[PDB]
Amino acid sequence: WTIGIINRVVQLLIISYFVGWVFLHEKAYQVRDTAIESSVVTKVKGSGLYANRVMDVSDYVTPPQGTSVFVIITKMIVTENQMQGFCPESEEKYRCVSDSQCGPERLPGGGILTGRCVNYSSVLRTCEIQGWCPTEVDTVETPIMMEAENFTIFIKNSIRFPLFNFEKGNLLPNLTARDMKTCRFHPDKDPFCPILRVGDVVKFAGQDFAKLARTGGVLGIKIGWVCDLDKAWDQCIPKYSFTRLDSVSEKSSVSPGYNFRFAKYYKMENGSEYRTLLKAFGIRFDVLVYGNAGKFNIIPTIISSVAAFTSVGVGTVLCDIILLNFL
Amino acid sequence: WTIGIINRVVQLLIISYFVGWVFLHEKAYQVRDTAIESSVVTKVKGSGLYANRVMDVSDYVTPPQGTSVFVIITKMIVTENQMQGFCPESEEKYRCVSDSQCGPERLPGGGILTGRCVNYSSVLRTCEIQGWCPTEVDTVETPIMMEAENFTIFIKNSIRFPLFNFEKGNLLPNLTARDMKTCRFHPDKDPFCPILRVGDVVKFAGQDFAKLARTGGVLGIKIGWVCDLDKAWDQCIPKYSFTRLDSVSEKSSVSPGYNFRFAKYYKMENGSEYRTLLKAFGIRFDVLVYGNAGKFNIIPTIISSVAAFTSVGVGTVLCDIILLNFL
Amino acid sequence: WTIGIINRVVQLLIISYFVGWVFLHEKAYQVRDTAIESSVVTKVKGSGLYANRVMDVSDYVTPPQGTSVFVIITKMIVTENQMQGFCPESEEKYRCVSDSQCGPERLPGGGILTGRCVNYSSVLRTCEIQGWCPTEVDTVETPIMMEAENFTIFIKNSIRFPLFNFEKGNLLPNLTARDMKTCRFHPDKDPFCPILRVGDVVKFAGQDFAKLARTGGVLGIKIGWVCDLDKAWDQCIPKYSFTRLDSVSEKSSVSPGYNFRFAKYYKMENGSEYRTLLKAFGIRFDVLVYGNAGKFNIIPTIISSVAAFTSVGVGTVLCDIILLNFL
Numbered sequence A, B, C: 001w002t003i004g005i006i007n008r009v010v011q012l013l014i015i016s017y018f019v020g021w022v023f024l025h026e027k028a029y030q031v032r033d034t035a036i037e038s039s040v041v042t043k044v045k046g047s048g049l050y051a052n053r054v055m056d057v058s059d060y061v062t063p064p065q066g067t068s069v070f071v072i073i074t075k076m077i078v079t080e081n082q083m084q085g086f087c088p089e090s091e092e093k094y095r096c097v098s099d100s101q102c103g104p105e106r107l108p109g110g111g112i113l114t115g116r117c118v119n120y121s122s123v124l125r126t127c128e129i130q131g132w133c134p135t136e137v138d139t140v141e142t143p144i145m146m147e148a149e150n151f152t153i154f155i156k157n158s159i160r161f162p163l164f165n166f167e168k169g170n171l172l173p174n175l176t177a178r179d180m181k182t183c184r185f186h187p188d189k190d191p192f193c194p195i196l197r198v199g200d201v202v203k204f205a206g207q208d209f210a211k212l213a214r215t216g217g218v219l220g221i222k223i224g225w226v227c228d229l230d231k232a233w234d235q236c237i238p239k240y241s242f243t244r245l246d247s248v249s250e251k252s253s254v255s256p257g258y259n260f261r262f263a264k265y266y267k268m269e270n271g272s273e274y275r276t277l278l279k280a281f282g283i284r285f286d287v288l289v290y291g292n293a294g295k296f297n298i299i300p301t302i303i304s305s306v307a308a309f310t311s312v313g314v315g316t317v318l319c320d321i322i323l324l325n326f327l
């Protein structure tokens, strides 16, 4: 019967359409490159106020080179004019009653204990230590640079897909509403402006500057390079996203936030040495570049095609058995 | 007719050859690892002259650890002995006529404005600012360290393909014409010597040292690790390439080059604090490691094979219809 | 004969089992993501002794931010109070007999030669140089901070597979025997504790602290994220490994170990400038994050399936020919 080949042919057509849409969707005809070779250069603009002193970019940004990971310092704890000597440490966990409990077996990873149980103050007696005296007092409260909210991070980024040798940057003037310098990134109003506001990146991360600034944190400015290299070059476009990477699990057991120490090293006119020890809290920024590019290639196209052919060839036989048996 | 199976068999053979060469070419029988786990350690050698002072590696290289991204400083702008205070800023964009136009709404991302319109000089009246005084004057011209051309970057690089747990380095003495220390990288005369000359990397990048040095720039020393792990180990060889990553698009709207500030922090015998503010221009180097390794594996070999079988099985039927119909 | 379809059917079943186990093993039904987007933050705890001075984290860790690559300084060579001037260099390779052999053509990549052959000491006459005087003497022996063995590296790591948008961290309290702070990483007794002991990482690397400390070295703390995202989330677990990346090939020709210089910059009450030049040896740590995630996906499942179907369809025909011919 000719209805055998009309039923057949119709069968073939419908099944072929399903399969074809599925494969063409996922671009299974494409080899993919996922090893994006990115380079990132950043610049911070702004000046803040702290105590009775002004902080400029050289004061609160570290490292100064503009690497993919940098810190804006928002709050700091100063221990000025330390000198090598012996002094009672200030952290309660060094508490003692006798010099018997200041031996080497106590806090083995801690400081260098001299062995003397000495009176730090009238209310607390701690083991004495040799090292930078006086010891740090990391249990006070200090101001935070509010002006950090109005600082700007300018993110130059140049990427290359090496499989296809396709290199492009995120400085796209034909894709920004405003001139390069005047523009600021809004995920909707200007998604390709490379100048981000610190408070913005804080808010897209969905976190509060006051709290973050105080305790420190790690924000990720993610640069994504999903591209179809079958398509025109003007279509390989970077999409920015924002997240808080020091995300706070409910369990905790470790102090959240971000802080690190470093010293400004001075030497006396006398000759002896003395430093200013700084415990710094601020927002670390991690520009995380992702990308993946697809291109037509003879081998994945052939493999995808053969897969389609055979899959339909079986689909019509099983559809014939299900139809003929009618259940 | 036996000519049916001679025509058939010949058909089969030719088509099979085409397909086989295509698949064997792309090594479709291989699973590929593209997540190269690289570690890079660099060392700069050389000394330059600047003003009436000598710069050695500790003076002009930053950071000193030898990371994958480091800067050779070729020109710098010194603002010596800054102190916290009030002074007219020097940048014309702060110009004012009355203190009415030095309110907070002016240059909100700029410095900390005191509110006074003051006479910086007799020809320019700018808003006064609180901060490091005197302000910077970033519109002058200074010399550049020419000797930077004769500096050398020694690039130790150790990579590992984790899918295959295949780790190798780029220090290959059996692959260099000269002893390790005496050798210098030439893309032809010695493509595996890990000691590169700064001016060389500048020239392979195709850019002029004088200009670059003056304005700063970002060069990429790309280490490529394309390897067939089916093949012998002696064949996993690194290939170096060189490119300028701060490439200059015609549109511009942002100053090209590379510069960053940082301060040397001093404290008076009196007690007050004072810094030397340095605006640094130089060549940043970005060692960008790429690699991808192939290996035979049962699954991609089976999939590739099945693809070949079916593709020929259809190719001979369609060749039979085209031949039989003769058009 | 019904034995034709019993032999057939049995054939089909056995071959189908072989193929099915092979494909299901390699999870060929999965698309794989190998572009792990990781962020690493590290903290060092401990204090060491060096000469008659104490070193704390700000003194011996660099950079202080806690990046994926940081150095614990174990031994250092101090050249105190350098000043710009002219002096005979101390390295024997500058040896001369007359000022004729101190011209510009000698050691062109070396220092700035003045041109005078001068008597450094009574036993050695070297070319004079302009630069930081006195010159460095990098041929002496100094102590090493032994307490570095009892220091701890705490490795916070947050990863994201962007293809599947699957983000997880290595801080897993339900996976550690001990509270987060008290725990220490043992590859068996606690493989998910993020606090590693320096001497531990040295020993898992299989190297001796005394020797390493003295000469410097590069250790890699590898964080591996092999995960089946078909499987439950609690199964995406990080596995740590440890290796020495400045591995010593037998050929050598370059000094092993790890060292870098940097200067502490001071200025006189007089006004002139003078630095302390430090040649630092220590253990650099490279947290190298790898990961690869698999997930079921319609396209690789279809391709794998079709491959299986056709492979069995041919396997039974060739098994029929081998059986029928009986050899």
Ligand SMILES: COc1cc(C(C)C)c(Oc2cnc(N)nc2N)cc1S(N)(=O)=O
Pocket (backbone or CB within 6 Å): A039, A040, A041, A156, A157, A158, A168, A169, A170, A171, B218, B245, B246, B247, B248, B249, B254, B255, B256, B257, B258
């Ligand atoms: C410091 O200079 C740079 C540096 C970079 C890299 C190194 C991040 C850069 O990346 C691009 C280069 N080319 C285009 N089309 N887009 C880019 N995003 C642009 C400049 S530039 N010319 O100053 O603005």
Ligand SMILES: COc1cc(C(C)C)c(Oc2cnc(N)nc2N)cc1S(N)(=O)=O
Pocket (backbone or CB within 6 Å): B039, B040, B041, B156, B157, B158, B168, B169, B170, B171, C218, C245, C246, C247, C248, C249, C254, C255, C256, C257, C258
């Ligand atoms: C600082 O020391 C290093 C460091 C590295 C890594 C960390 C970059 C190194 O990488 C190799 C190690 N092994 C081989 N075969 N090739 C390499 N390229 C070699 C030395 S070394 N032994 O001083 O020259």
Ligand SMILES: COc1cc(C(C)C)c(Oc2cnc(N)nc2N)cc1S(N)(=O)=O
Pocket (backbone or CB within 6 Å): A218, A245, A246, A247, A248, A249, A254, A255, A256, A257, A258, C039, C040, C041, C156, C157, C158, C168, C169, C170, C171
């Ligand atoms: C500095 O703070 C951080 C930072 C990070 C990243 C930036 C490395 C971090 O990574 C995780 C975040 N969330 C989970 N579940 N696991 C993690 N490993 C945890 C903390 S935290 N909350 O202080 O301990």
Ligand SMILES: *[C@@H]1O[C@H](CO)[C@@H](O)[C@H](O)[C@H]1NC(C)=O
Pocket (backbone or CB within 6 Å): A104, A105, A108, A109, C146, C147, C149, C150
């Ligand atoms: C580390 O601390 C232990 C005490 O817990 C001590 O016995 C050991 O000697 C220390 N290691 C070094 C190298 O000092």
Ligand SMILES: *[C@@H]1O[C@H](CO)[C@@H](O)[C@H](O)[C@H]1NC(C)=O
Pocket (backbone or CB within 6 Å): A268, A270, A271, A272
């Ligand atoms: C140098 O002088 C300071 C006080 O000005 C003193 O505390 C210190 O001990 C002196 N240095 C030496 C080595 O005596």
Ligand SMILES: *[C@@H]1O[C@H](CO)[C@@H](O)[C@H](O)[C@H]1NC(C)=O
Pocket (backbone or CB within 6 Å): A146, A147, A149, A150, B104, B105, B108, B109
């Ligand atoms: C940022 O600048 C605007 C002026 O453009 C000002 O109104 C605002 O208060 C500033 N933000 C902070 C946190 O000071």
Ligand SMILES: *[C@@H]1O[C@H](CO)[C@@H](O)[C@H](O)[C@H]1NC(C)=O
Pocket (backbone or CB within 6 Å): B268, B270, B271, B272
């Ligand atoms: C310290 O002395 C300098 C001049 O030598 C002076 O300008 C400065 O104001 C003094 N510091 C204080 C706190 O008075």
Ligand SMILES: *[C@@H]1O[C@H](CO)[C@@H](O)[C@H](O)[C@H]1NC(C)=O
Pocket (backbone or CB within 6 Å): B146, B147, B149, B150, C104, C105, C108, C109
């Ligand atoms: C580099 O050294 C050579 C001598 O080997 C010298 O002729 C040349 O002038 C030097 N280059 C520069 C820029 O000084």
Ligand SMILES: *[C@@H]1O[C@H](CO)[C@@H](O)[C@H](O)[C@H]1NC(C)=O
Pocket (backbone or CB within 6 Å): C268, C270, C271, C272
């Ligand atoms: C400053 O004084 C030191 C000695 O205290 C001297 O060596 C140096 O030359 C002086 N500086 C100048 C510029 O004379």
Ligand SMILES: [Mg+2]
Pocket (backbone or CB within 6 Å): A091, A136, A138
């Ligand atoms: Mg403390």
Ligand SMILES: [Mg+2]
Pocket (backbone or CB within 6 Å): B091, B136, B138
């Ligand atoms: Mg300025």
Ligand SMILES: [Mg+2]
Pocket (backbone or CB within 6 Å): C091, C136, C138
């Ligand atoms: Mg030397």
Ligand code: NA
Pocket (backbone or CB within 6 Å): A303, A306, A307, B303, B306, B307, C303, C304, C306, C307
């Ligand atoms: Na197939």
